[PDB]
Design a protein around this ligand. Structure first.
Ligand SMILES: [Mg+2]
Ligand SMILES: [Mg+2]
Lengths: 412, 412
């Protein structure tokens, strides 16, 4: 039983030698200097290089570093009896001291099924979320409050209703919205709920509110439990600013039992490099799903800072692969989103995704309501097998949006 | 009052545009469209671009990206009234969504003295640690257990004595040593304590044991309290696998009040890139000191994966700068350390540093005892104002080390 880590290494020295050094150094330390009695005793703890794939040199990389660097994908097996069954131990074992060893990037981690079962996975997952929001087939639609810092509860409820009246399925706090005297955590939840229950009357549409769960680590459980008691819909959580283990703790507390939406804030300090860090499919995908995120927002493959397409798809696959013993987590590609991209979003990610209108929903000629209607019309059009312009010719809200941002081609 | 973040940006679009966008977008969001009444109300919350230092375009960088990128250091002021007084809020505000914005690297964070005051700093610091171990003037000496995974308490005690008998001031668990039936956390503490007491009786030498504090986040405080009750000397903590806020929680708990040694494990997933992440002076230095680390181990500027000298010195400076309202934290340059490097270590870092013999101490011809004797002899030589070889001529352990690994010249 071992966790197999896959790394990308760049080095001017023999990679196999370095790899063997890692497998041994980060497990038992030494082997050839051990008596026979100790070798048999420590055998089960010995790490091993499972595979090495030569990638050939890159002149682009060589020029950058100013030297010839060999490249290779290295796989190392770390016996699970070597560490406790918790994420901090997993990270320290597979990428603790190793993260300091020059050019090494963690690409993936694979675990025996028995080890995976020691972790929770999402509590609700895609199926649970759809039931809680009451939308069973079409992809969901979410938006974000605009400029709420320094604003009051009257503004919050007002802006919340506008978005819900726009037909969005979920509205979340801006990740930088922290508790204040004007906007107390508990009050955002209770007033937000009452306000959304009003829109429920005016419009059968039921909208959820993902409230930001912030503050010090050891105060999180108490607040989350209170949120559950107050009937909060979803807890937005800046997991990377805390630790993966904290997300797991929130997921496993039966007194909370509220959906958790993981925000990508700070994940960029770890994922973008070609030579260092941890690949997004693992950092934002596999590990967050395993830890307990019901929703995972991640860099979309569209816009000014688009994540490489295959990377984005890799994240979504990790979140939804049904070969895993965990419920599926909702993939939410974020940033660079507009109604004209809905057709492409659905083609790339499928029906079980969430269209994140973000704060942009407010940039529609007719406010959030118009912005929400434009997105809902766009989603319906795609599912009905119709071109947006075709549907737009019958939907002004969508018409306005298309004229302002255009339509992205989905044909291959 | 406002926190000023300093960033390094690479981009093909106007840097000033992006800077203003960040200042506004990550604070109030909108300003021009707001009525004079709201502006005066939200003035307090408005972010501002403090300065922009244009840098010379880099041919190497342009060749790597295959595009011409302008470079600049941008400083942005974030009103402290915008976020709660905790590290997670600080990180999310200054490098949350921004960490996802292409090529942006966080270089530094400056806090108003008034804001810093809401954080603990080290509980003991350099002076407190020197008193706890009873060593003044000379730099301290520490070593690490070798090959403990899969071993028992009898082995731990025997290995601990060997190191203490070698004259080391502190011995720490390997950062990858997790709790097990063979080596329970509480047992390592009590058995280690007894063994170290026996050594004092024998040589009058005092040696501390830094025990690894691991496992799930919400079980840390309870076990740390037990450690304090059991008389643990120091708590080794893989902070980067848990979150900076957790370190602060351990520091602020009066029921713990045990020195904390922060390990660099996983910090390399964040610090190495030229274009992304967080600079080590901030990530390993300034923030860990503010959070409560009494010791900070960081990549040394020596050996196979040496950190650029200025970077290493920058970390030490942040840890010891007397201008901060926090006690100084012990700088511990780690990796690539051997007796022959002692003169340079002291010349580079001064006397208030710790020579980390690491696991290399066991590699001395005469085991850890000889290894420690070699290091102590080298330290005394520098303090006695004499060349290492002069002392080596009177100390066999030191000569063996020199002939084994050589002496690093310090003459400029
Ligand atoms: Mg936001
Ligand atoms: Mg170690």
């Amino acid at each position: 039983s071992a966790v197999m880590a896959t790394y990308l290494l760049h080095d001017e020295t023999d990679i196999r030698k370095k790899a063997e050094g890692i497998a041994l150094g980060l497990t038992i330390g030494t082997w050839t200097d051990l008596p026979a009695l100790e070798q048999e005793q420590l055998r089960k703890h010995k790490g091993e290089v499972v595979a090495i794939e030569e990638l050939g040199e890159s002149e682009r990389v060589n020029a950058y570093f100013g030297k010839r660097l060999k490249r290779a994908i290295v796989k190392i097996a770390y016996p699970t009896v070597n560490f406790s069954a918790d994420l901090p131990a997993l990270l320290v074992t597979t990428f603790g001291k190793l993260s300091l060893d020059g050019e090494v990037r963690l690409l993936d981690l694979e675990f025996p099924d028995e080890w995976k079962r020691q972790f929770p996975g999402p509590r609700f997952g895609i199926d649970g979320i759809r039931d809680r929001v009451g939308v069973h087939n079409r992809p969901l639609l979410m938006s974000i409050f605009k400029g709420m810092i320094g604003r009051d509860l009257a503004y919050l409820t007002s802006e919340l209703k506008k978005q819900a009246l726009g037909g969005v399925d979920l509205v979340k706090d801006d990740e930088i919205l922290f508790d204040s005297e004007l906007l107390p955590f508990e009050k955002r939840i209770t007033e937000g709920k009452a306000a959304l229950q009003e829109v429920y009357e005016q419009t059968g549409k039921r909208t959820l509110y993902a409230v930001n769960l912030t503050g010090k680590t050891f105060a999180l459980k108490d607040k989350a439990k209170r949120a559950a008691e107050l009937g909060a819909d979803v807890l937005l959580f800046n997991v990377f600013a805390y630790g993966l283990d904290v997300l797991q703790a929130l997921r496993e507390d039966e007194e909370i039992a509220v959906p958790i939406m993981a925000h990508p804030a700070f994940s960029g300090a770890v994922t973008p490099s070609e030579f260092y860090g941890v690949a997004p499919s693992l950092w934002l995908g596999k590990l967050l799903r395993l830890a307990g995120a019901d929703f995972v927002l991640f860099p979309s493959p569209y816009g000014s800072v688009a994540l490489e397409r295959e990377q984005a798809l890799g994240i979504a696959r990790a979140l939804t692969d049904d070969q895993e013993p965990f419920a599926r987590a909702f993939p939410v590609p974020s940033a660079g989103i507009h109604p004209g991209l809905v057709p492409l979003i659905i083609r790339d990610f499928g029906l079980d995704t969430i269209v994140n209108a973000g704060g942009g929903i407010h940039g529609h000629p007719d406010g959030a309501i118009g912005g929400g209607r434009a997105f809902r019309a766009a989603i319906d059009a795609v599912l009905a097998g119709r071109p947006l312009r075709a549907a737009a010719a019958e939907n002004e809200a969508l018409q306005k949006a298309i004229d302002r941002w255009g339509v992205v081609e989905v044909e291959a």
